[PDB]
Design a protein around this ligand. Structure first.
Ligand code: CLA
Ligand code: CLA
Ligand code: CLA
Ligand code: CLA
Ligand code: CLA
Ligand code: CLA
Ligand code: CLA
Ligand code: CLA
Ligand SMILES: CCCCCCCCCCCCCCCC(=O)OC[C@H](COP(=O)(O)OC[C@@H](O)CO)OC(=O)CCCCCCCCCCCCCCC
Ligand SMILES: CC1=C(/C=C/C(C)=C/C=C/C(C)=C\C=C\C=C(C)\C=C\C=C(C)\C=C\C2=C(C)CCCC2(C)C)C(C)(C)CCC1
Ligand code: SF4
Ligand code: SF4
Ligand code: SF4
Lengths: 152, 26, 82, 163, 40, 721, 137, 80
């Protein structure tokens, strides 16, 4: 953390100006009122906006003038990894739990492989939303989240 | 001096390859 | 059609292709060659003579004026940091 | 087997179960006559005499390439002395010949060569093979090679045609 | 008409699913582009 | 497997899924009924034609709505040809770059812009119609296949009448096709382009149909059109010579072949294909029995010959497919080497970016198709070769002395390999040791290609002497002292041939001979071998026959195509490299006011392409700087694809250097982890088959390798040209 | 069973090839195969192509043994033909192999001798052990 | 040459024999299974070691096992 925040940065600020000047260089040959015109100018506002937002949310920015994320767990920078990370695992589990729940329901009777290549069973009866509460799989763990066939 | 030895370092492969050839076909 | 356990040779490509020629000979000049090529006909003795004939290679390199073994002269480069 | 065959590719010596076939290149009187002659062939002749012919011819041939394409093409100093190089090759080439001759012993069950001509005459042996025979031949080659080398240099070390 | 449904229920399902997923993701990026963090 | 019932049966392993696609088009493995197969493939061709037709519709459509073709028309010299536009999402809009004409788009290299100008197309209105007409055709073609498989499928007897099919295809399609196009040229292409070369502007050009109706507009230029009766019926034909000529060479203002020549060309080609169309026997007497004529040729060397061929090439698709693939591929290659030397389109040669990519594209397509000929030729030997019913005798003997052909071809490759690559290793060693006199160079011991230099010499002195009607040369690479310069760019110039040109041709001799070796060895030894006397019973596509006999890996004819596939890559990959450097170094460049010509790399080909280090530095390292510095610019995608290809390529080595036994054992440990958590699929996961792993390997190798140059070349010529 | 023996028989029509015997036959071994055809048919012939079968005893000389069986197994299929092949050697000698018992190996016969039969069952093999043998005895 | 063994876990389906192109195996009267036959490996000298026999075996793991040992011309599959 030798980095000083993107607000009091001279490099990250300089980098903003450099990028928009190059974009401005391009619209000079098309004449305003034209299509390639807005597209360039629309790109410029997005450029200004993203530079503006990064300074707001914190983001430390190294000497190179680009934001560096801090994943130490620091409460000041939770939004840089932990909060998106919690969101990922949620969806990651949800997918995992829904998929597992499917192959389980299929196994008894029928031709199980038939359901795997073709699933004219959609979410089975109603399996998707079951993922809304996947984390309750912790309670599935205390019972039989795992099979006892091989080892423990 | 050093212009006598790298060739015997090349006479030696000739000698070694010949001897070994006789050894392996025997 | 023609397989004969009696002769196993013609059965196989045992026969010398007509390129064999077991004909006469060549002029009497041979009487000369047989006299002077004899020491090299012994084998093993010749193997040695040729290897020790490698003493020629040593002699030829110990004494050799025109092979690049001299700079010829220059002032050498320092050169990246001396 | 002549001559209304109206076709070329007679099975090798009448045997269609031995791999090879009869073609003009394989068997044409001109080719056959040519092949029958030469030192490698010409069985029943002294091996030393044959090596000399072969050796002498090759040694002479080797000089040209070495002298012309040598590191000193291109030099009085290396005007043709490179022929010495051609000579060295025949020194080495005589080793390879000598060591190969040790694959034939002196017992020697002389000759691994076929014991019959085509036409299955069933008569005669070859003798190039065998320890004594092969060795004579090398010695001839060595002799023939060194000489062919010197002679070719000779003419070149005088020449006049073609400068 | 049972047949068309099944037909749409093979690996094509994957394309439709990933097309729908892509559309969602792109549109999310339209409304919230250049997102390096979750700040709420 | 949808195609077969047992195949469809049920899935127990994942191998079923891979097999399903692998034998999807393998029509002769689904039935033994020849008629059923033929009916299948015939409909399949319709479905193909629909796709390429749809493909064309999108090219015309995009040219209309998403291109600056009109803008390029007025100022072709320094406007960059661009079709297709990128939506401004997740930062994409940077790929939209300055291409001139006040337009933002990706610069293209297909060459449609040059095609459209030649056709006399002037407005998006015209492109819009052609797009719809193509879609209408695409609807037909797709419908036509459905109609000829479910409603009215032809008999086997229909397909077997090859004589009738021949007569039509090289007359009804070729002849009238050439003739029909010949008409559009002199009525639309030639008049309109004549205006375009006069700087009249497209909107100031009258509409094409006004040229056809009243002769007045078309007659003021090319006054032979003035006579209503026309001198054609007078059969003098000398009067017509104004709109068509045998001038040849190149127009100094448009840089393409004179349309004045191409019209005459098609006029000749048309009837030449119309006459040659009247050859084979049908129903009304006059004609040939190809069966009869084929039988007639026999020989002291061939004994019976060609007898029985007609039976083979009328009952075996793979036999016909091999022949067609062998020459259609060969045709694509000569197309590449005829369009570069004789630029047939207006402002084509000037557009260096298009020319490099056109030549390179045709070389790969031609290269691939030829390799495919090897496959189906081998498939024929395994599946359709039956001496009992269809003996040829030509095929025999070939099989009879097959150990001979391969052994000789084996030797030639070694001779060529030494006498090609070795020379370079010589030069690389003599230069490193500080003795350039020793090297094979124009400055030292030179190996001049006097034969090629002599053929070019006679082509230069051809007009007037052995070609009176020819005013100028065929191509300006055979010119002598001529120089065409469209814009500030050089369209074409006499191409020199030196010792550096002697080496590279001998490398192409090599690479082609080895590629032939691998493929031809797989075809002849497809059925039997001393090693495997019954290989034909193992099929065409099998991995092996065990570790026995020391090891019998890749003995299949399939694997010979697999090995020869890399070599076809190695081959072309160096042809296109020869093309790129030679054109940049000794042809392409800018011409000044005085007449001094500066080439892109400045004639460094002659003394630096004789070294391996020279290609690695002066060519690769040098000309890469564009692709590796394309970040933050319009050519951003090429930089990424350059890196992206390098990956799919190194990704192939994973499949090629290993075997499935390792992977299956690894999966075992992974299946265990699944069974612990109730997440084991009923469809048991299996590793790829031994043969599939090779198929997967070579595809990614070719993709990553080919793709990687694609980005190489397209980044280079665009930034420089 | 008494081996029948082969003396002289005519060879099938063919005209030659480059896949025939070569030197190995002269110095090590070569294999011959005999079969009787009820018709002058046409068979593929390994290591080449197209040869007329002939009608009669039919005698053919090949190499590797395997080449003979391949032909023989094709000879038993397609055409309902019985066949037998031997290993000639270079100095006469009469080694007759296959069928041998006189009844095909695939068909169980009364007095053959097991040779290399393990009544342990696989997976019950040991681990070395620096002593001679590998454990799959 | 190569070393081949047969195991009592065999069921006498005779597919290993039909697969062999050199005739290394054969069937044998036995009392161990319903077929009352069992594979035999008398002629290991002609064995090339291609494991065609193993790819025809239906027993859970092979009743016939080929152990590639010393190499000979016959095992090397040479015709020259
Ligand atoms: C009009 C609608 C229609 C319908 C309902 C059918 C229905 C059927 N067809 Mg027919 N067919 C049609 C149109 C249709 N077809 C057309 C327009 C053609 C001309 C090309 C054909 C040519 C054809 C042949 C040769 C055969 C059939 C067969 C069949 C039967 C089996 C289906 C099958 O082949 O497996 C699979 C179903 C598919 C849809 C496979 C996909 C193939 C399409 C064309 C892919 C499209 C190309 C794609 C864009 C390539 C780019 C991919 C890219 C994204 C990477 C089934 C009754 C088969 C049969 O009779 O069984 C023995 C058969 O032999 N069809
Ligand atoms: C696997 C490593 C990895 C990771 C962690 C990221 C992460 C990210 N990428 Mg990158 N990307 C990657 C690999 C990766 N990418 C690769 C290999 C490529 C080459 C194809 C790209 C090409 C790429 C582009 C072109 C862009 C990104 C962008 C982004 C950012 C977008 C955040 C967002 O979508 O808004 C939020 C989205 C959600 C919150 C979706 C979840 C909500 C669901 C749908 C509903 C949940 C309901 C409860 C994010 C930081 C974008 C960016 O602007 O960077 C800052 C962007 O423009 N990536
Ligand atoms: C004249 C054109 C032509 C035609 C009509 C055929 C027809 C056929 N071929 Mg042939 N082939 C050709 C050209 C042709 N081929 C050429 C030029 C080659 C040399 C490369 C081959 C090499 C070849 C082999 C090795 C085989 C065939 C086989 C077959 C048969 C069935 C195989 C199948 O269904 O495909 C299946 C289709 C797939 C498995 C799809 C594979 C995925 C492709 C290769 C990826 C392509 C990448 C893409 C272009 C770019 C990347 C896109 C991606 C990133 C999204 C069928 C008769 C098979 C056969 O056994 O014959 C009966 C066989 O094994 N062909
Ligand atoms: C077959 C070749 C082909 C290829 C490779 C393309 C490729 C493309 N087209 Mg074209 N198109 C084609 C044929 C083709 N098209 C034909 C025959 C027509 C006439 C009906 C069109 C009419 C068309 C229009 C009107 C547009 C495109 C657009 C596009 C681009 C955006 C992708 C897209 O559609 O979003 C995804 C597609 C879907 C979600 C539907 C499936 C993409 C480069 C768009 C574009 O150029 O962007 C500015 C655009 O608006 N295409
Ligand atoms: C003389 C007229 C004529 C024309 C123009 C064609 C054209 C074609 N044929 Mg047909 N053919 C003809 C006569 C003709 N054929 C006759 C008399 C027979 C009976 C022996 C056949 C039997 C035949 C078979 C078995 C096959 C073809 C196929 C093809 C297509 C191959 C693609 C191509 O060559 O490039 C260019 C393609 C075009 C320029 C498209 C042309 C647009 C339509 C089809 C033209 C309609 C004519 C119109 C009234 C003018 C092409 C469309 C192959 C095919 O693709 O299957 C469908 C195929 O396998 N033909
Ligand atoms: C057999 C001798 C003969 C010859 C040499 C000609 C020659 C000619 N005719 Mg005539 N014609 C002929 C017989 C002949 N015709 C006969 C038997 C009839 C039917 C009675 C016609 C009906 C006819 C018409 C309607 C026209 C011609 C026209 C023409 C001229 C062609 C100009 C054009 O644009 O088209 C050309 C001079 C055109 C013309 O008059 O030129 C302006 C014209 O429109 N011809
Ligand atoms: C052997 C090489 C060779 C080749 C490939 C050609 C090729 C050609 N010649 Mg030439 N010609 C040659 C040798 C050759 N010629 C020689 C040695 C002589 C001297 C007797 C001529 C005298 C000659 C004349 C007088 C003419 C041609 C013409 C032609 C062209 C048309 C031929 C034709 O009418 O229908 C196929 C064609 C490009 C014609 C031409 O110039 O086209 C405009 C023409 O009138 N040639
Ligand atoms: C660049 C080439 C390359 C790549 C990318 C890999 C990658 C991998 N190897 Mg491999 N390997 C290679 C070359 C390569 N190898 C070579 C030359 C050899 C010597 C023969 C080996 C020998 C080898 C062995 C012995 C093993 C591996 C293993 C692995 C896996 C390790 C798991 C991992 O770290 O990340 C996971 C995967 C990746 C990082 C790459 C996945 C590719 C992308 C990221 C997937 C995304 C697809 C994307 C959506 C595009 C879609 C395409 C579209 C057409 C659908 C990984 C898949 C091991 C393994 O299998 O562990 C499980 C292992 O046992 N490799
Ligand atoms: C030094 C410069 C002078 C050039 C001469 C040397 C260069 C040319 C090489 C000589 C080849 C001889 C061709 C004889 C002309 C010729 O081919 O004769 C063809 C000859 C004719 O047979 P028939 O008369 O029976 O043909 C009619 C019937 O058989 C068919 O219905 O058939 C054979 O020769 C069978 C054996 C094949 C011969 C294989 C040799 C193949 C050579 C391979 C090299 C190809 C080079 C191509 C380069 C483009
Ligand atoms: C905090 C943090 C961190 C750290 C981390 C760590 C270090 C941790 C850890 C961790 C660990 C060390 C963990 C472990 C574990 C374990 C186990 C043993 C597991 C399991 C599991 C399971 C069983 C799952 C299942 C499932 C589910 C539930 C979902 C879906 C899927 C399935 C279905 C698959 C860092 C600092 C980095 C970042 C920031 C934050
Ligand atoms: S590793 Fe594969 S190709 Fe090699 S012997 Fe084994 S099965 Fe055959
Ligand atoms: S490995 Fe081959 S030769 Fe040996 S027993 Fe098995 S099938 Fe017979
Ligand atoms: S495959 Fe196995 S079970 Fe069948 S006969 Fe051979 S050893 Fe016995």
């Amino acid at each position: 953390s030798g980095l000083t925040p993107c607000k009091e940065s001279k490099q990250f600020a300089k980098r903003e100006k450099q990028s928009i000047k190059k974009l401005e260089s391009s619209l000079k040959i098309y004449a305003a009122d034209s299509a390639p015109a807005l597209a360039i100018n629309a790109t410029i506002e997005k450029t200004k906006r993203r530079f503006d937002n990064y300074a707001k949310q914190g983001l430390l920015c190294g000497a190179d003038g680009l934001p560096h994320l801090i994943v130490s767990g620091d409460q000041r920078h939770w939004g840089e990894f932990i909060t998106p990370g919690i969101l990922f695992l949620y969806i990651a589990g949800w997918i995992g739990w829904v998929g597992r729940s499917y192959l389980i329901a299929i196994r008894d009777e029928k031709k199980p492989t038939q359901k795997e290549i073709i699933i004219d069973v959609p979410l089975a009866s109603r399996l998707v939303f079951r993922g809304f509460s996947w984390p309750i799989a912790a309670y599935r763990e205390l019972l039989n989240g795992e099979l006892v066939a091989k080892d423990v | 001096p050093s212009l006598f030895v790298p060739l015997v370092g090349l006479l030696f492969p000739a000698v070694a390859m010949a001897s070994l050839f006789l050894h392996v076909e025997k | 059609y023609f397989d004969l356990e009696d002769i196993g040779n013609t059965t196989g490509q045992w026969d010398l292709y007509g390129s064999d020629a077991p004909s006469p000979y060549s002029p009497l000049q041979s009487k000369f060659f047989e006299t002077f090529a004899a020491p090299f006909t012994k084998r093993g003795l010749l193997l040695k003579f040729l290897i020790l004939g490698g003493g020629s290679t040593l002699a030829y390199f110990s004494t050799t004026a025109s092979g690049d073994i001299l700079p010829i002269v220059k002032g050498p480069q320092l050169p990246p940091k001396l | 087997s002549e001559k209304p065959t109206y076709q070329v590719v007679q099975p090798i010596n009448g045997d269609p179960f031995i791999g090879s076939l009869e073609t003009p290149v394989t068997s044409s009187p001109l080719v056959a006559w040519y092949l029958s002659n030469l030192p490698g062939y010409r069985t029943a002749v002294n091996p030393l005499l044959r090596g000399i012919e072969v050796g002498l011819a090759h040694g002479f041939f080797l000089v040209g390439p070495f002298v012309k394409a040598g590191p000193l093409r291109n030099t009085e100093y290396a005007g043709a002395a490179g022929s010495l190089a051609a000579a060295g090759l025949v020194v080495i080439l005589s080793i390879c010949l000598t060591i190969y001759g040790i694959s034939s012993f002196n017992e020697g069950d002389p000759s691994t060569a076929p014991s019959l001509t085509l036409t299955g005459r069933k008569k005669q042996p070859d003798q190039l093979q065998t320890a004594d025979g092969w060795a004579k031949f090398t010695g001839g080659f060595f002799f023939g090679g060194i000489s062919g080398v010197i002679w070719a240099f000779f003419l070149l070390y005088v020449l006049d045609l073609p400068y | 008409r049972d047949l068309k449904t099944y037909l749409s229920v093979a690996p094509v399902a994957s394309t439709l699913w990933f097309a729908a997923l892509a559309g969602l993701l792109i549109e999310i990026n339209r409304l919230f582009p250049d997102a390096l963090t979750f700040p709420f | 497997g949808h195609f077969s019932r047992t195949i469809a049966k049920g899935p127990d392993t994942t191998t079923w899924i891979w097999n399903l696609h692998a034998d999807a088009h393998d029509f002769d493995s689904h039935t033994s009924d020849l008629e059923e197969i033929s009916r299948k493939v015939f409909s399949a061709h319709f479905g193909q034609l629909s796709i390429i037709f749809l493909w064309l519709s999108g090219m015309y459509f995009h040219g209309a709505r998403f291109s600056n073709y009109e803008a390029w028309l007025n100022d072709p010299t320094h406007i960059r040809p661009s079709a297709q536009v990128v939506w401004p999402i997740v930062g994409q809009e940077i790929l939209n770059g300055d291409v001139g004409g006040g337009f933002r788009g990706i610069q293209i290299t297909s060459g449609f812009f040059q095609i459209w100008r030649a056709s006399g197309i002037t407005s998006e209105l015209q492109l819009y119609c052609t797009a719809i007409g193509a879609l209408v055709f695409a609807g037909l073609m797709l419908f036509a296949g459905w109609f000829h498989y479910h409603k009215a499928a032809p008999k086997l007897a229909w397909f077997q009448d090859v004589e009738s099919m021949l007569n039509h295809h090289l007359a009804g399609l070729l002849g009238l096709g050439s003739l029909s196009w010949a008409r559009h040229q002199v009525h639309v292409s030639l008049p309109i382009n004549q205006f375009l070369n006069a700087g009249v502007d497209p909107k100031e050009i009258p509409l094409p149909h006004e040229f056809i109706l009243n002769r007045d507009l078309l007659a003021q230029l090319y006054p032979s059109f003035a006579e209503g009766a026309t001198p054609f019926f007078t059969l003098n034909w000398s009067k017509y010579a104004d709109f068509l000529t045998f001038r040849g060479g190149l127009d100094p203002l448009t840089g393409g072949l004179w349309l004045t020549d191409i019209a005459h060309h098609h006029l000749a080609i048309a009837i030449l294909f119309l006459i040659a169309g009247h050859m084979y026997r049908t129903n009304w007497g006059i004609g040939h029995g190809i069966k009869d004529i084929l039988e007639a040729h026999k020989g002291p060397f061939t004994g019976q010959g060609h007898k029985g061929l007609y039976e083979i090439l009328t009952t075996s698709w793979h036999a016909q497919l091999s022949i067609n693939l062998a020459m259609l591929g060969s045709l694509t290659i000569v197309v590449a080497q005829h369009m570069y030397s004789m630029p047939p389109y207006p402002y084509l040669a000037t557009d260096y970016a298009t020319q490099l990519s056109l030549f390179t594209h045709h070389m790969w397509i031609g290269g691939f198709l030829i390799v495919g000929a090897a496959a189906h030729a081998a498939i024929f030997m395994v599946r359709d070769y039956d001496p009992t019913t269809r003996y040829n005798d030509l095929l025999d003997r070939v099989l009879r002395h097959r150990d001979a052909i391969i052994s000789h071809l084996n030797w030639v490759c070694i001779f060529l390999g030494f006498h090609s690559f070795g020379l370079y290793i010589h030069n690389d060693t003599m230069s490193a040791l500080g003795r350039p006199q020793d090297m094979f160079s124009d400055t030292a011991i030179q190996l001049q290609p006097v034969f090629a230099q002599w053929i070019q010499n006679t082509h230069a002195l051809a007009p007037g002497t052995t070609a009176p009607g020819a005013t100028a040369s065929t191509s300006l690479t055979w010119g002598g002292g001529d120089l065409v310069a469209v814009g500030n760019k050089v369209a074409l110039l006499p191409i020199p041939l030196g010792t550096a040109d002697f080496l590279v041709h001998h490398i192409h001799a090599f690479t082609i001979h080895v590629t032939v070796l691998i493929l031809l060895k797989g075809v002849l030894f497809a059925r039997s071998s001393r090693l495997i006397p019954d290989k034909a019973n193992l099929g065409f596509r099998f991995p092996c026959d065990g570790p026995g006999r020391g090891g019998t890996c890749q003995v299949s004819a399939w694997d010979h195509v697999f090995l020869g596939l890399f070599w076809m890559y190695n081959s072309i990959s160096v042809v296109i490299f020869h093309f790129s450097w030679k054109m940049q170094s000794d042809v392409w460049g800018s011409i000044n006011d005085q007449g001094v010509v500066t080439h892109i790399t400045g004639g460094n080909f002659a003394q630096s392409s004789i070294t391996i280090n020279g290609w690695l530095r002066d060519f690769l390292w040098a000309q890469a700087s564009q692709v590796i510095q394309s970040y933050g610019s319009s050519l951003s995608a090429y930089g990424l694809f350059f890196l992206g290809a390098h990956f799919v390529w190194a990704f192939s080595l994973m499949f090629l250097f290993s075997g499935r036994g390792y992977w299956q054992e690894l999966i075992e440990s992974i299946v265990w982890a699944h069974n612990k958590l109730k997440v084991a699929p009923a469809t048991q996961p299996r590793a790829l088959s031994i043969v599939q792993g090779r198929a997967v390997g070579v595809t990614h190798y070719l993709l990553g390798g080919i793709a990687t140059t694609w980005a190489f070349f397209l980044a280079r010529i665009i930034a420089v040209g | 069973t008494p081996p029948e023996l082969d003396p002289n028989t005519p060879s099938p029509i063919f005209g030659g090839s480059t896949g025939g015997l070569l030197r190995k036959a002269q110095v090590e071994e070569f294999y011959v195969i005999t079969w009787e055809s009820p018709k002058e048919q046409i068979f593929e012939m390994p290591t080449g192509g197209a040869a007329i079968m002939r009608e009669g005893p039919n005698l053919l000389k090949l190499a590797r043994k395997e080449q003979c069986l391949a032909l023989g197994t094709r000879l038993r299929s397609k055409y309902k033909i019985k066949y037998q092949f031997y290993r000639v050697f270079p100095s006469g000698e009469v080694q007759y192999l296959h069928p041998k018992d006189g009844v095909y190996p695939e068909k169980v016969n009364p007095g053959r001798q097991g040779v290399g039969v393990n009544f342990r069952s696989i997976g019950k093999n040991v681990s070395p052990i620096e002593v001679k043998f590998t454990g799959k005895q | 040459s190569h070393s081949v063994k047969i195991y009592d876990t065999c069921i006498g389906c005779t597919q290993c024999v039909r697969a062999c192109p050199t005739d290394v195996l054969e069937m044998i009267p036995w009392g161990g299974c319903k077929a009352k036959q069992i594979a035999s490996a008398p002629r290991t000298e002609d064995c090339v070691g291609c494991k065609r026999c193993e790819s025809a075996c239906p027993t859970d793991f092979l009743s016939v096992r080929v152990y590639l040992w010393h190499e000979t011309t016959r095992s090397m599959g040479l015709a020259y």
